[PDB]
Amino acid sequence: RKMAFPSGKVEGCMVQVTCGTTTLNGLWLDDVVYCPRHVICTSEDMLNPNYEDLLIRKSNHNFLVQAGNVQLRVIGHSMQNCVLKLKVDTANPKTPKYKFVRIQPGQTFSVLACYNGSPSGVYQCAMRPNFTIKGSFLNGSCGSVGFNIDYDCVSFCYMHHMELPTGVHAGTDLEGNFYGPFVDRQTAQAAGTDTTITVNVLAWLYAAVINGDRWFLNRFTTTLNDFNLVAMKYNYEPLTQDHVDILGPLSAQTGIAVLDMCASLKELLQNGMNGRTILGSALLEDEFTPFDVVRQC
Amino acid sequence: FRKMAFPSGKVEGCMVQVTCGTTTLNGLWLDDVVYCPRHVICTSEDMLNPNYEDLLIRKSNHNFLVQAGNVQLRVIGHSMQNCVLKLKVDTANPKTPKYKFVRIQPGQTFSVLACYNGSPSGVYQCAMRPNFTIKGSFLNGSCGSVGFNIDYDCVSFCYMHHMELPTGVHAGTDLEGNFYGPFVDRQTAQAAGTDTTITVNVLAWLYAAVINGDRWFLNRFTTTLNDFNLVAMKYNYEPLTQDHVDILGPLSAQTGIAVLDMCASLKELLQNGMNGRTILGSALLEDEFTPFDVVRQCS
Numbered sequence: 001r002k003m004a005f006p007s008g009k010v011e012g013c014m015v016q017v018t019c020g021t022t023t024l025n026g027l028w029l030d031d032v033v034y035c036p037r038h039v040i041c042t043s044e045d046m047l048n049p050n051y052e053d054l055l056i057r058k059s060n061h062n063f064l065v066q067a068g069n070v071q072l073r074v075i076g077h078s079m080q081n082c083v084l085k086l087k088v089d090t091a092n093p094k095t096p097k098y099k100f101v102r103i104q105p106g107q108t109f110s111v112l113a114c115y116n117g118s119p120s121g122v123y124q125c126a127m128r129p130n131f132t133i134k135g136s137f138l139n140g141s142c143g144s145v146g147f148n149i150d151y152d153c154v155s156f157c158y159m160h161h162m163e164l165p166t167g168v169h170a171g172t173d174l175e176g177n178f179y180g181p182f183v184d185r186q187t188a189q190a191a192g193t194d195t196t197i198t199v200n201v202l203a204w205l206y207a208a209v210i211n212g213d214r215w216f217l218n219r220f221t222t223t224l225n226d227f228n229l230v231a232m233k234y235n236y237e238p239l240t241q242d243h244v245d246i247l248g249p250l251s252a253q254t255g256i257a258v259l260d261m262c263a264s265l266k267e268l269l270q271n272g273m274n275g276r277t278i279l280g281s282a283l284l285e286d287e288f289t290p291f292d293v294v295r296q297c
Numbered sequence: 298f299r300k301m302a303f304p305s306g307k308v309e310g311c312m313v314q315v316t317c318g319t320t321t322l323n324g325l326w327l328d329d330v331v332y333c334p335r336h337v338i339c340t341s342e343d344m345l346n347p348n349y350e351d352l353l354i355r356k357s358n359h360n361f362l363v364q365a366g367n368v369q370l371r372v373i374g375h376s377m378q379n380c381v382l383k384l385k386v387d388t389a390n391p392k393t394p395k396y397k398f399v400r401i402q403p404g405q406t407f408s409v410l411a412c413y414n415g416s417p418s419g420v421y422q423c424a425m426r427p428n429f430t431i432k433g434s435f436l437n438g439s440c441g442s443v444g445f446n447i448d449y450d451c452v453s454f455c456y457m458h459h460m461e462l463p464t465g466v467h468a469g470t471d472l473e474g475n476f477y478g479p480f481v482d483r484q485t486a487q488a489a490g491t492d493t494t495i496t497v498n499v500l501a502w503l504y505a506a507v508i509n510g511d512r513w514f515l516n517r518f519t520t521t522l523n524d525f526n527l528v529a530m531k532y533n534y535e536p537l538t539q540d541h542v543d544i545l546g547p548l549s550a551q552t553g554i555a556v557l558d559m560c561a562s563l564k565e566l567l568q569n570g571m572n573g574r575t576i577l578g579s580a581l582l583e584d585e586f587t588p589f590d591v592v593r594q595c596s
């Protein structure tokens with residue numbers, strides 16, 4: 001049921017980028033290759049890298065870019081925040097229509113995990129409210145990107161840079177700005193306390209109804225403020241009226257008003273699932289947006 | 298751990314649409330052959346119980362509309378192999394990957410590229426249940442979508458989608474047209490046997506927890522494969538095969554925990570329960586990660 005966008009259009013952009021003894025992935029659009037800047041670091045550098053300093057000392061030819069069997073000639077380089085932009089001589093014919101976007105926490109995106117420029121897997125993630133993502137990224141995955149696809153247009157929203165000690169991951173948009181308070185230095189970093197994406201739990205509960213599962217529903221009802229009071233108590237995000245509007249289609253399709261579902265969710269939070277499960281999970285799932293659930297139903 | 302699909306681009310480049318009359322479903326275009334479910338040739342008056350051989354004799358090459366996008370692919374031949382249609386076309390797919398057709402076993406996982414009218418919608422990871430059904434996400438027009446695994450540069454095609462059952466699960470064939478399980482391609486009521494838990498995958502998951510340092514559940518004892526299997530069946534778990542034991546090898550080697558020792562640890566979990574304890578942050582035993590999947594995400 002957890003569904004990623006088809007990754008073919010992105011696969012045709014993935015290349016390998018090497019500098020010294022560091023190898024990671026880059027994204028090749030038109031005649032520019034994007035990758036994490038920490039590729040220019042050495043072991044010593046990575047603790048407190050002075051990137052502008054390290055970069056000026058670098059030559060176009062210190063960057064080996066490989067697209068499969070082929071090598072691409074770097075003819076220029078520049079830095080945009082934490083992303084290194086490498087101009088090359090040849091354009092990627094497989095470049096798709098695209099745009100660069102910075103997603104809000106709570107929004108989901110597909111990740112194409114790559115190693116040495118070769119696609120390995122694809123999966124769905126959500127930008128957590130503390131701006132980490134719960135990914136499956138190992139050594140060599142840096143430069144893997146996250147994206148959405150609308151019609152024929154790929155929106156790139158994420159580029160992977162690091163793993164925190166807790167096992168979650170962090171990265172930047174394609175402008176090179178981190179999501180969250182993180183920095184691209186080799187230090188143990190901790191995120192803010194994470195919260196649960198309420199509107200997504202709600203979309204998912206509706207999804208469970210649509211699929212014939214409704215043991216958690218109740219006749220009770222709640223106000224929006226009183227629901228948010230309980231939500232905040234259990235480290236759930238508050239629900240905005242835009243969030244309620246967005247749940248509309250799902251309300252309609254099932255005949256369960258948003259606040260009815262909020263009431264059901266409130267009982268779940270205060271009681272628990274008591275052995276029962278929902279769509280197979282024993283925990284409330286918060287990485288399905290309303291749009292995700294709709295598109296798949 | 299999360300459900301992780303193979304990148305779909307190599308399969309995207311093979312998806313086309315096949316139409317008979319107003320009936321449109323998806324096909325798989327490899328070299329100069331298009332593969333699709335034979336029930337594309339059915340009307341509605343015909344789906345209750347079709348006579349496929351008699352429905353086909355009446356068909357000609359020029360009744361088949363195959364399209365890659367809006368571009369027509371002319372059909373120059375047609376045959377029926379079990380429940381799949383093979384349409385020979387006048388153009389060899391330039392995007393044809395290295396590929397093979399494999400028939401998988403219950404328990405094995407694969408990625409599905411859910412397509413509508415030949416356009417990819419989404420990709421996700423499915424497990425073939427022991428009752429030969431998959432817990433998919435398919436709507437109308439999704440038939441002919443395929444399931445695959447990728448090994449090196451080679452796509453192994455293992456599943457083509459044909460139908461949904463009363464209980465909401467899905468059934469289909471291999472790429473040679475042979476159904477998985479007892480089902481037939483007819484618009485009739487069909488129930489799958491009782492589902493059981495995929496033991497080999499539960500074991501892979503325990504290995505996965507040990508690899509990550511979560512090992513409270515290992516005990517000092519072992520068991521025979523037969524004794525484990527007889528106790529497993531009493532808890533609605535699948536018995537283990539010799540192949541299951543063999544595909545657990547690498548994880549056994551990685552951890553130094555013999556397969557039958559891990560079976561004894563599971564046996565004790567089944568008999569005594571968790572006792573309020575969690576494994577990989579969960580009180581449920583997960584059964585949709587194969588030993589190959591555990592490696593993909595750990596190593």
Ligand SMILES: *[C@@H](O)[C@H](C[C@@H]1CCNC1=O)NC(=O)[C@H](CC(C)C)NC(=O)OCc1cccc(F)c1
Nearest residue numbers: 038046137138139142161162163184185186187188
């Ligand atoms: C890509 O280059 C790589 C992928 C990471 C590492 C393994 N899983 C992943 O997601 N990134 C890094 O290695 C990154 C480089 C720096 C210069 C940003 N550092 C990192 O992932 O480790 C962070 C860390 C954890 C604990 C303690 C510590 F000091 C640092």
